[PDB]
Amino acid sequence: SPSAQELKEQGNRLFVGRKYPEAAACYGRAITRNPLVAVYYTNRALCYLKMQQHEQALADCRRALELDGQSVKAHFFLGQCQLEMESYDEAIANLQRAYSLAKEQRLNFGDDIPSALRIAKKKRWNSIEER
Ligand SMILES: CN(c1nnc(-c2c[nH]c3c(F)c(F)c(F)c(F)c23)o1)[C@H](CCN1CCCC1)c1ccccn1
């Protein structure tokens, strides 16, 4: 009988091993034990994004944000999901929000957030210029 935290860690390990459906199933088992922990939904959202399930990834970002509105990771993954869905304005605003929250929380992700923002902004510009 694994605990919710053991299942979340098993999910993280499987994600690093590129076993995305198995990792998402582990996060689901963690949610069964404790459905009020935001990171179980944020981490499963990234599995759904890797599995090209954008609507499920969006839904899990929403569940995470209803539990932890200060989540840098929920905003970052939501922006990455929206970028793949071509919802450019929303993607940029969520990535900008992850940047501000990371700065307020003194979290260091190297250049990941500004790099993701430049990628999203360039994709938006090119899509508008080429219609
Ligand atoms: C990969 N990972 C992970 N946690 N945070 C990021 C991340 C990278 N860049 C970011 C970024 F720019 C942001 F703004 C932001 F908010 C972020 F959260 C991030 O990535 C974990 C595993 C963690 N591991 C163990 C200790 C270190 C590594 C995870 C996530 C989902 C599923 C499975 N596992």
Curated annotation (Swiss-Prot):
TPR repeats: 4-37, 38-71, 73-105
Cell compartment(s), UniProt: Cytoplasm; Nucleus; Mitochondrion
Organism domain of life: Eukaryota
PTM info: Auto-ubiquitinated; mediated by UBE2D1 and UBE2D2 and enhanced in the presence of MAP2K5.
Tissue spec. comment: Expressed in differentiated myotubes (at protein level). Highly expressed in skeletal muscle, heart, pancreas, brain and placenta. Detected in kidney, liver and lung.
Subunit note: Homodimer. Interacts with BAG2. Interacts with E2 ubiquitin conjugating enzymes UBE2D1, UBE2D2 and UBE2D3. Detected in a ternary complex containing STUB1, HSPA1A and HSPBP1. Part of a complex composed of STUB1/CHIP, VCP/p97, CHRNA3, and UBXN2A that modulates the ubiquitination and endoplasmic reticulum-associated degradation (ERAD) of CHRNA3. Within the complex UBXN2A acts as a scaffold protein required for the interaction of CHRNA3 with VCP/p97, this interaction also inhibits CHRNA3 ubiquitination by STUB1/CHIP and subsequently ERAD. Interacts with MKKS. Interacts with DNAAF4.
Other observations noted: Antibodies against STUB1 are found in patients with chronic lymphocytic leukemia (CLL) and in colorectal cancer patients.
Protein name: E3 ubiquitin-protein ligase CHIP
Organism: Homo sapiens (Human)
